[PDB]
Design a protein around this ligand. Sequence first.
Ligand SMILES: *[C@@H]1O[C@H](CO[C@@H]2O[C@@H](C)[C@@H](O)[C@@H](O)[C@@H]2O)[C@@H](O[C@@H]2O[C@H](CO)[C@@H](O)[C@H](O)[C@H]2NC(C)=O)[C@H](O)[C@H]1NC(C)=O
Ligand SMILES: *[C@@H]1O[C@H](CO[C@@H]2O[C@@H](C)[C@@H](O)[C@@H](O)[C@@H]2O)[C@@H](O[C@@H]2O[C@H](CO)[C@@H](O)[C@H](O)[C@H]2NC(C)=O)[C@H](O)[C@H]1NC(C)=O
Ligand SMILES: *[C@@H]1O[C@H](CO)[C@@H](O)[C@H](O)[C@H]1NC(C)=O
Ligand SMILES: *[C@@H]1O[C@H](CO)[C@@H](O)[C@H](O)[C@H]1NC(C)=O
Ligand SMILES: *[C@@H]1O[C@H](CO)[C@@H](O)[C@H](O)[C@H]1NC(C)=O
Ligand SMILES: [Cl-]
Ligand SMILES: [Cl-]
Ligand SMILES: [Cl-]
Ligand SMILES: [Hg+2]
Ligand SMILES: [Hg+2]
Ligand SMILES: [Hg+2]
Ligand SMILES: [Hg+2]
Length: 524
Amino acid sequence: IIIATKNGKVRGMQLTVFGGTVTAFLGIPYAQPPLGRLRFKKPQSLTKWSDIWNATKYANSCCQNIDQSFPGFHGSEMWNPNTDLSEDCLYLNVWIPAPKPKNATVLIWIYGGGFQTGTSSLHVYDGKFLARVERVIVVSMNYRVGALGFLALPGNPEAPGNMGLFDQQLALQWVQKNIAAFGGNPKSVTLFGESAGAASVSLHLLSPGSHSLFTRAILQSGSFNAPWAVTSLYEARNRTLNLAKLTGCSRENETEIIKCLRNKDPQEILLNEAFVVPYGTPLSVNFGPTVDGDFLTDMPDILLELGQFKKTQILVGVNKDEGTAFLVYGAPGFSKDNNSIITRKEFQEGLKIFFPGVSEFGKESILFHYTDWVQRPENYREALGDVVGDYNFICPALEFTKKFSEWGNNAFFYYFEHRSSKLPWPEWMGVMHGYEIEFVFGLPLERRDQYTKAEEILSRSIVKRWANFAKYGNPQETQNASTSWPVFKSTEQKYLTLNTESTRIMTKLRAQQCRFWTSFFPKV
Ligand SMILES: *[C@@H]1O[C@H](CO[C@@H]2O[C@@H](C)[C@@H](O)[C@@H](O)[C@@H]2O)[C@@H](O[C@@H]2O[C@H](CO)[C@@H](O)[C@H](O)[C@H]2NC(C)=O)[C@H](O)[C@H]1NC(C)=O
Ligand SMILES: *[C@@H]1O[C@H](CO[C@@H]2O[C@@H](C)[C@@H](O)[C@@H](O)[C@@H]2O)[C@@H](O[C@@H]2O[C@H](CO)[C@@H](O)[C@H](O)[C@H]2NC(C)=O)[C@H](O)[C@H]1NC(C)=O
Ligand SMILES: *[C@@H]1O[C@H](CO)[C@@H](O)[C@H](O)[C@H]1NC(C)=O
Ligand SMILES: *[C@@H]1O[C@H](CO)[C@@H](O)[C@H](O)[C@H]1NC(C)=O
Ligand SMILES: *[C@@H]1O[C@H](CO)[C@@H](O)[C@H](O)[C@H]1NC(C)=O
Ligand SMILES: [Cl-]
Ligand SMILES: [Cl-]
Ligand SMILES: [Cl-]
Ligand SMILES: [Hg+2]
Ligand SMILES: [Hg+2]
Ligand SMILES: [Hg+2]
Ligand SMILES: [Hg+2]
C-alpha cells in the first residue's frame, strides 16, 4: 500500500474495522515546517521528496497550551493533544476505504479548539469508521493555533495573520492535487468541523482562495459570526504588541518586533499568550481569525450580509447544552463535582465573567431576559448555561444559517439533544459542547466501547446523513424509514433534532433568546 503523490510516494498501513479493512496514511506532511524564519509566515510549499515516506502514525501536534484544570479527568484530557507538540505540525491524515475506492467523496475535518488548541490525532477524530462504513475518504490536518498560527500585524508578511487558516487552505489544496491518487474525487470535497473548526469552515466559504478547494460544508457548533470567532483589527494589534512586551520584544519597527519573536522559544510564546488580554473569559480566543486582507478581504459580517460567499449547500447545527462546558472554568459556584446550584448573586457574578467589557445595563438585560421563570433551584444554573450557549454558539449559528439561505442555497439545521451514556462530565452539564463529534465519527458503531444500542442506531443514522450530505448535498437517510430533513428556509426555519428517542421537525429554535442576542445585545 504505497501511493504516489505530487511530492513523493507514501506508505500507508491497513486497519481492521468492522470485519473489513481501511487504509490509513497518518501523518502525511503537506507544508514546509513553519520553523525559524518561517514562524508566523504563511505555510510555504513543500519540497518534493524521494524514497517512500512512512505515514503510519500521527505526526506532531502543533504548539499550544494545555487544559490543566482537571488532571486525570477524562472529560477534559480527551481533548488534550496526544502526540508531541512541535512547530513541525503541518501534517495531514488520509483514510481511504478498502479496497481502493473509484471516485469517493472526500470529507475534510477541521478540528476545533478556540483557535488556540486542538489536533487531528484525537480519538474522536479517527476517520476510519466513516471510511469503513460510507466508503468516503476522510482527511484531517493539523493547523497552527495560538499566536503561532494567528499572530497578526496587518499588511506585514512576517506575521500577517490567519496562518492557521492558510495552513488549512494549503491542506485543502493538497487534497485537490492528490486525493485523486488515493481514489478520491476532488470535485466532491465536503469540509466539516466543530466549534473553531466550524468557524474555520464558515470562513472558507467567505475566502476567495478556498472557493474551488471544496464543494459543500458542515458546521458543527460554530460559525464565523460567533462572538469569539474573529479578532478585530484593534484587539489584534494591541495583543500582538502586548505579546511583544511580555517577551521583551517591544521594538518600534514592527518587522523587528517580529524577528525578536522568531528567536524566542516555542514555549515562551505559549507561556505569554495567555496574558495579551486584560480580563479574558473561559471563551477568550487570544489569537484567531482577523481581516488580513488576504484570506479575509472585509469584515466577515458584511461579506455574509451582502451574500459574498461560495454558493453551496451547508449543514449547520448545535448541541442542546453548548454553554455548560464553560461554566466550570471560572463561573463561581460551579464544579463538575456537584450540582452547581448557584444563587442569583452567583449568576450575576457569572455574567461578569463572560461579558467582561459589557456595561452594567447590558448585564441587567441578559439577566432580565433570562430570569423569567415558569420558584425552582436549578433555575440560575441552567440560565447561565443557556446565556453562554445561546450567545456564543446557538444564536450565531442560527443567524449564519439564516443569512446564508437568503442567497438561494439549501441549508439544513440540526439540534443535537442526546447526552452520551459514556459522558464523563456531570449530568447537569447535559448535551455538552463538542459531544456530538463522537456520534458524527461513528465511534458508537463500534460495539465494544460501551455505548448503548440506541446510540449506535443514532450514530449510524447521523453518519449516513452526513455522508449523504457530502455525496449528494442532501442529509437524508432514505432507507430505514426515518424522518425527512427539511431545508432551512429564512421564514419557516425548520431544524431537525437528533436524539436516540423520536426525531422531530421543529421551528425557529430559541426564537425569543436569539432575538435578544442577534438584534438587541449588539447595541449595548
Ligand atoms: C491593550 O493593551 C494594554 C496593555 O496591556 C497590559 O500589558 C500587556 C503586556 C498585558 O500584560 C496586559 O495584561 C496588560 O493589561 C491594556 O492596558 C492595560 O489595561 C489594564 C486594565 O485596564 C491595566 O491594569 C494596565 O495598567 C494597562 N496597561 C497600560 C500601560 O495601558 C489595554 O487594556 C489593552 N486593550 C484592551 C484589550 O482593552
Ligand atoms: C460546588 O463546589 C464549588 C467549588 O468547590 C470545590 O469542590 C469542593 C470539594 C469544595 O469544598 C472546594 O474544595 C472546591 O473549590 C463550591 O463553591 C465554593 O464554595 C466555597 C464555600 O461556599 C467558596 O469558599 C468557594 O469560593 C467556592 N468556589 C468557587 C470559587 O466556585 C460550591 O459551593 C459547591 N456547591 C454545592 C454546595 O453543591
Ligand atoms: C517504513 O516502514 C517499512 C515497513 O515497516 C520499513 O521497512 C522501512 O524501513 C520504513 N522506512 C523508514 C526507514 O522510515
Ligand atoms: C469523478 O466524478 C467526476 C464528476 O464529479 C468526473 O469528472 C471524474 O472523472 C470522476 N473520476 C473518476 C471516476 O475518474
Ligand atoms: C437500517 O437497519 C439495519 C438493521 O435492520 C441497520 O443495519 C442499518 O444500519 C440501518 N440503516 C441506517 C444507516 O440507519
Ligand atoms: Cl497532559
Ligand atoms: Cl438584583
Ligand atoms: Cl426517525
Ligand atoms: Hg472519550
Ligand atoms: Hg438521549
Ligand atoms: Hg415539536
Ligand atoms: Hg428584548
